[PDB]
Amino acid sequence: XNXXX
Amino acid sequence: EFEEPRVIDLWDLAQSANFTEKELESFREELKHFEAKIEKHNHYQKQLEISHQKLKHVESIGDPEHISRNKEKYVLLEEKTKELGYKVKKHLQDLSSRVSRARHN
Amino acid sequence: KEFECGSGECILRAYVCDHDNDCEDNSDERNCNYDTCGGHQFTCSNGQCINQNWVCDGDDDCQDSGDEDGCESNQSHHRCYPREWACPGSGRCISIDKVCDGVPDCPEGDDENNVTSGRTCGMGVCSVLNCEYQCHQTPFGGECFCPPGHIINSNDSRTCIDFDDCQIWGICDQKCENRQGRHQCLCEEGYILERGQHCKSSDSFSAASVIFSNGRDLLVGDLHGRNFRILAESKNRGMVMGVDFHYQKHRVFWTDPMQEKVFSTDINGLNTQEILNVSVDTPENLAVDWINNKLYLVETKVNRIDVVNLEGNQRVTLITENLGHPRGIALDPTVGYLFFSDWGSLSGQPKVERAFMDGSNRKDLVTTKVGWPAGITLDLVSKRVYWVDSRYDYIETVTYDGIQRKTVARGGSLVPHPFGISLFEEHVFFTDWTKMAVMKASKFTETNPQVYHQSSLRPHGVTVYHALRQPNATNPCGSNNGGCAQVCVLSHRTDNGGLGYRCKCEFGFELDDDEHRCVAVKNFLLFSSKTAVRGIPFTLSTQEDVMVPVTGSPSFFVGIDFDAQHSTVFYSDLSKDIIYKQKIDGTGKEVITANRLESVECLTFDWISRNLYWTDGGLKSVTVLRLADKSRRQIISNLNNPRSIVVHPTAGYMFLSDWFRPAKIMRAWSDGSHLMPIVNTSLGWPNGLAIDWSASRLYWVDAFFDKIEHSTLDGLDRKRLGHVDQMTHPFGLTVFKDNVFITDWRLGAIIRVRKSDGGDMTVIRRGISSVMHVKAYDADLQTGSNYCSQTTHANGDCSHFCFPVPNFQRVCGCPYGMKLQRDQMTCEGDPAREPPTQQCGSLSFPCNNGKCVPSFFRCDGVDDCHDNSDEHQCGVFNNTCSPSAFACVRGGQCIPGQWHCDRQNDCLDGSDEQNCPTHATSSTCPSTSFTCDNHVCIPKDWVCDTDNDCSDGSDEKNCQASGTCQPTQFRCPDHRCISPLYVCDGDKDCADGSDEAGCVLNCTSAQFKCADGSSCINSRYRCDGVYDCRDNSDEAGCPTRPPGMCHLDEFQCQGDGTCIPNTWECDGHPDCIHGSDEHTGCVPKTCSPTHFLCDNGNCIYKAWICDGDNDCRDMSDEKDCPTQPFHCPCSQKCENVVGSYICKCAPGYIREPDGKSCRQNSNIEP
Amino acid sequence: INQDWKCDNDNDCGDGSDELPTVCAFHTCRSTAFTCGNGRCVPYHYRCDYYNDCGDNSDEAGCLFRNCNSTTEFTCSNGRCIPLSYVCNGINNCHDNDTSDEKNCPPHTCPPDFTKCQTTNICVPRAFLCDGDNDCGDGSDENPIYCASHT
């Protein structure tokens, strides 16, 4: 996934 | 200021390495000592076969004294070239490895 | 001719005096003198200097073995000392006065009668062996012996030979001499011989005292342990971790890892003061340089070894490379060395290592059987270094060169977990976390260390306070600061041509060519991380941070940018939702804004107009803020996933990347108008943007297709860089000079490739926990001007905002709630369209700095606003306290409920600990578990493991060497008993590695076994693009596309052969360069009658049309109907169309722009 | 005419129709252009340029102009620095609105075909007289001392 979270 | 084929590439590989100017400056002064070991080894490398033929010529003559005397010099001369053989190799490995690691990253 | 040798030979000039026997009569080197060896070399008893790394590399280097003199301890080559004998059952030697004295002295009973093996302590051998001097009883018979100074000859065992008494370990303290005149001990200046063999401190010096940390507070006590004075109690639930002292100024320095500060106090008390309070989040250890009055300290949050003055100024970072877990530190200013221990390094091995006091020449001093080195002290007079191990449980000693390794104490029953260590005279003082006490032990060999101030916590530091412990010497930097412009740091005495010092530079400056003048640094690589924001040199020759790291306990840094004019760095902390600015040297930190932030992905700074931009992934918008006056405006809104933003001041454009499903890179004026897509095809997950200022090109990275592209500022002439080796998930990038610095998430590293085609990828920093953004600090590029920075008038005559605009123009702007007047330069308030707004909602307390937290966070003993506004003035004037807190009895203070009855006295009046009932309930520990005397349950397998799992030392009590391990435990040979889960875990827990000996791997089907059989990895890492296995076997044999084709799962672009996922074919958006994935044969899609059909093909409810939300996610439902009033209620295969025809190339062929021709894509010549 | 040329204190039409007051009494300027006090627009780079383009001299108001020394300045009222031997050389070059560059040197005079407009020392070429443009700096280019009927 590319989400920074 | 270099002549040995082995040392020449090390200096060339050194200029593309991670060496700081102070590290590079001290690196050259180590290669100078490394070449002196090589040229010392190279000088005795000739002397081994020169005395080997000298030992062979005397053995053909047949004098027990000259055979014994030349052999006594010969075996010690073999120790000289054998002992210098590893010192050159050991220094070669360290220098090659250091520039290999400095170029690894 | 030439050098005539001693027997008439033409020896070459350079052969004489080259440390080699060249002359035939051994006379070629007598008449000259040699050089001495520098600090980085080892003198090998012949004058021959060899590299420090050659010492104990396993290879003899001086035909004397002088550099391999027993650097492994407890070996087979005993050849035991006079009046000693070896019991055959083990590698142990016992003195004759013990051997067969009637009591078993080898623990196995191998020096007394063993009839089961047919051995008795006999004496009959002397009758025929006919000893030269004396005989004794052994399990073999009468053994011959000879007086001290001589040992039994090994040819015959009847004669005896002259032996050196000075070679026995512990014959005399310090040094001994006079081999011919029998052994005698010499004590140096300030030392006097007592009783013989015992150096003793002179009466002229003050009484020796031991200062140490009992776990929470600093204590002082004399050597005999008769008195114990508390020197300084810790405040605010602090902890004294590492202590040290300066004698001449009579000061004690200690570090408080919990408060995150370094303190200094006078030896008698008073004059307590902080020394460092920034970037010291975890100051593990400490060591003062008394000769130069410096304070070396170990920091473990950002692993490094710093140097400061005794009053805290002039910070310099010395050693940073390859430091993973620095724990111990010590130095000897007299000779110039610095010793520190690293119980885990980035390469993997733990090491005790030596360096100059400036980090010039690092050498791995101890590497074999090193485990977890936890503390270092050094005998300043015998030139030895003592270190302890918490894992292999020993205390060991090597020379300053690491040659002679000897052990003084070992075994889990003696030193279960040593942390600190110090020595004085003959006794080593070390603290241990398992026995929870300071311990005294002889510096030579201790059979049972005596106790010293048993404590109820983990004792963290110990050192001996005495004058002889800090010798008496002249500092080279005393002569007018050594000529150094800023900082003069010592080195080895032989370094710098004999000067013994080098000049160092503070953080904001760099050392010039003359290595004496410090000039301001101009460029360095600034990068963020989850843990800290760091600035490192662009060159990899030196890896020392150029700016002091920015760090916080709760921290997640993502956005970064710099302001070279004032040498400040902006950053955003994703855990606090606050944007800070901090100077390079760390002196001044303030907040830019902390109001209305959700997830600030990326900052960017317009250095000319001084406007700070940032994207907000939570609000799905970008905001511009001016620094001179805090005007703030949300210029762009209603985005989907804005990640990276770059602003071009001179050109006038701002560039932006959105990584939603129809991903695009957009550009707009700095105003925020003219927002139009610039790259919206063949794109997915554009995580980062950068501008090549030298050529005016826009670089960006794609984390889905795993590529780096670049293009002009108009999006035209798009080119793709070459394949990067292991880049599999790039996040951020920057362009500096010829190279591009890409950050990778999966690699967790910063890599550098050429901006032309990629090329020679070089890893800059591996091992970053979460790397995020990079940025090229550069004072050269932050120059220039436009109409927003004219010298003749203010900021372009615009009142609040001025924005650069293409073709060198400028436009003005106004804050929120304020409107631009007719003049187009001055603003006026507009409460009609943008009415005033409060700091935030109702169920929230507005903090002073702009933040606001859920109300119940008010007055609960925890600083949630990060400026202590929510914890200000609690429990008074009905400014009451939350239920989650503990209120003080008299009021005026409230503390977290976890602090109630927590054995710490937090509240001032002590009410938090008074009247606290016990918790000795009627409870059972599970029979599969062991009951600590603290009444906490631990697994029964953790007993006698030499680790304090109970936090009270109960589980390791009574675990003497006389015992077994539990049936569910494995035995380390005379080391400890371990859990079986540590057998074939991968690493050696045993002292000799008996836990990992010769067992094989059991990798499961959910894992993959590397070809070398070294280790297994998860099946997810098989065929991903990263060499997880050491031999790269995980990536060998992985599937590839056919040459010029794409996998069956994908879809191929007709225009240029790009491979895209099959789902991207016929999904409404032209994900191809020429629309190949949205051809005429595309079956369209519709939605339910109760659903609206968005432009991109989404379906949203009838009531949701123009409801005020981006349900369509492309604004179709909002942009369509605005009627809401104010109220108060062919060369290859061909395809046919209506009149024309479509030429389709077969897979592996690409269509030429003419629309008819097809070209093969494989570079294989037919 | 281009729309950039509307009411910018320059007679682009050649007759004042583009400078007509009753349209720029309502017309607003382009966000990228400076605005004078009278409301007429002006390209921004004319701001603080030593030229009175606004008419009200507002485009030159409050500019921190450079100081210079007598070797290259006589303190022309607009703030220009103009070289020595270029003051009182016979031709205006600092474009002072009173033509103060030359008039500071009273007693000079020049031969004909270089007209001494008024009593000031300047001597403009005769070809500029009655060419339709008032460019002597003084009044004597089209005021009734010539070009009235003798042409």
Ligand SMILES: *[C@@H]1O[C@H](CO)[C@@H](O[C@@H]2O[C@H](CO)[C@@H](O[C@@H]3O[C@H](CO[C@H]4O[C@H](CO)[C@@H](O)[C@H](O)[C@@H]4O)[C@@H](O)[C@H](O[C@H]4O[C@H](CO)[C@@H](O)[C@H](O)[C@@H]4O)[C@@H]3O)[C@H](O)[C@H]2NC(C)=O)[C@H](O)[C@H]1NC(C)=O
């Ligand atoms: C490193 O280098 C420094 C500088 O040379 C040394 O410091 C000196 O060390 C000696 C050894 O202790 C000190 O000598 C003692 O001085 C005491 C008084 O001096 C203090 O007070 C005076 C003012 O009255 C100050 O000027 C001075 O700085 C000190 O603060 C005496 O009281 C001592 O004698 C007492 O004990 C003896 C028995 O031991 C009795 O016979 C005497 O009657 C008396 O009761 C003693 O003379 C000297 O003062 C130190 N000077 C300084 C400036 O510190 C370090 O020792 C040195 N380190 C090493 C190991 O070499």
Ligand SMILES: *[C@@H]1O[C@H](CO)[C@@H](O[C@@H]2O[C@H](CO)[C@@H](O[C@@H]3O[C@H](CO)[C@@H](O)[C@H](O)[C@@H]3O)[C@H](O)[C@H]2NC(C)=O)[C@H](O)[C@H]1NC(C)=O
């Ligand atoms: C993805 O980007 C492309 C290119 O920016 C968008 O296509 C359209 O491209 C033209 C420029 O070639 C843009 O301007 C138009 O140019 C023509 C002349 O060729 C002119 O007659 C039109 O009046 C117009 O100015 C056009 O604005 C641009 N479309 C948009 C909406 O920007 C393409 O649309 C982009 N993808 C998406 C999803 O919009």
Ligand SMILES: *[C@@H]1O[C@H](CO)[C@@H](O)[C@H](O[C@@H]2O[C@H](CO)[C@@H](O)[C@H](O)[C@H]2NC(C)=O)[C@H]1NC(C)=O
């Ligand atoms: C760090 O320690 C030094 C003393 O060496 C101290 O001067 C620094 O600033 C002080 O910090 C105090 C707490 O923040 C503050 O109350 C005090 O006003 C301030 N003193 C001055 C004048 O600078 C310390 N810095 C910090 C942030 O602790």
Ligand SMILES: *[C@@H]1O[C@H](CO)[C@@H](O)[C@H](O[C@@H]2O[C@H](CO)[C@@H](O)[C@H](O)[C@H]2NC(C)=O)[C@H]1NC(C)=O
């Ligand atoms: C809560 O916080 C304020 C500070 O913002 C603190 O001053 C208040 O204490 C006092 O409460 C009084 C009401 O009982 C009020 O009259 C008084 O002005 C106020 N402060 C002073 C000057 O004593 C806290 N409580 C309240 C109720 O606001």
Ligand SMILES: *[C@@H]1O[C@H](CO)[C@@H](O)[C@H](O)[C@H]1NC(C)=O
């Ligand atoms: C006897 O022992 C000595 C060492 O003490 C050794 O050097 C020598 O080679 C041995 N042999 C004899 C017979 O001397």
Ligand SMILES: *[C@@H]1O[C@H](CO)[C@@H](O)[C@H](O)[C@H]1NC(C)=O
């Ligand atoms: C696990 O690996 C070991 C290696 O000794 C092997 O003997 C055994 O068959 C494997 N299977 C299991 C789960 O025991």
Ligand SMILES: *[C@@H]1O[C@H](CO)[C@@H](O)[C@H](O)[C@H]1NC(C)=O
């Ligand atoms: C005056 O002229 C001199 C050169 O002769 C120059 O140094 C100086 O800067 C000038 N201006 C002032 C303000 O003195």
Ligand SMILES: *[C@@H]1O[C@H](CO)[C@@H](O)[C@H](O)[C@H]1NC(C)=O
């Ligand atoms: C500037 O010169 C103009 C003529 O172009 C003149 O009308 C005006 O009076 C001058 N300014 C002043 C302050 O005299």
Ligand SMILES: *[C@H]1O[C@H](CO)[C@H](O)[C@H](O)[C@H]1NC(C)=O
């Ligand atoms: C030995 O040579 C080194 C070379 O760097 C230093 O000059 C050193 O000081 C010399 N030895 C001594 C004791 O001065």
Ligand SMILES: *[C@H]1O[C@H](CO)[C@H](O)[C@H](O)[C@H]1NC(C)=O
């Ligand atoms: C109120 O909110 C607006 C946006 O709706 C602006 O962010 C403004 O700055 C806010 N005002 C305050 C006091 O923070």
Ligand SMILES: *[C@H]1O[C@H](CO)[C@H](O)[C@H](O)[C@H]1NC(C)=O
């Ligand atoms: C005080 O007020 C706060 C805020 O409303 C909480 O309600 C808290 O529980 C109150 N406590 C007391 C003792 O009144």
Ligand SMILES: *[C@H]1O[C@H](CO)[C@H](O)[C@H](O)[C@H]1NC(C)=O
């Ligand atoms: C403390 O309180 C607990 C509560 O369960 C028990 O009553 C326990 O016995 C008490 N301790 C003592 C020493 O009485």
Ligand SMILES: *[C@H]1O[C@H](CO)[C@H](O)[C@H](O)[C@H]1NC(C)=O
């Ligand atoms: C990858 O797979 C293809 C078949 O799809 C070919 O076997 C190709 O040779 C493989 N890759 C390489 C580099 O050999």
Ligand SMILES: *[C@H]1O[C@H](CO)[C@H](O)[C@H](O)[C@H]1NC(C)=O
């Ligand atoms: C598309 O699907 C929707 C689903 O509700 C309707 O069935 C609609 O009639 C379909 N459109 C066409 C052209 O078949």
Ligand SMILES: *[C@H]1O[C@H](CO)[C@H](O)[C@H](O)[C@H]1NC(C)=O
């Ligand atoms: C003013 O005129 C400019 C230039 O023609 C624009 O038309 C603008 O929309 C007008 N109105 C305002 C309020 O600036």
Ligand SMILES: [Ca+2]
């Ligand atoms: Ca020699």
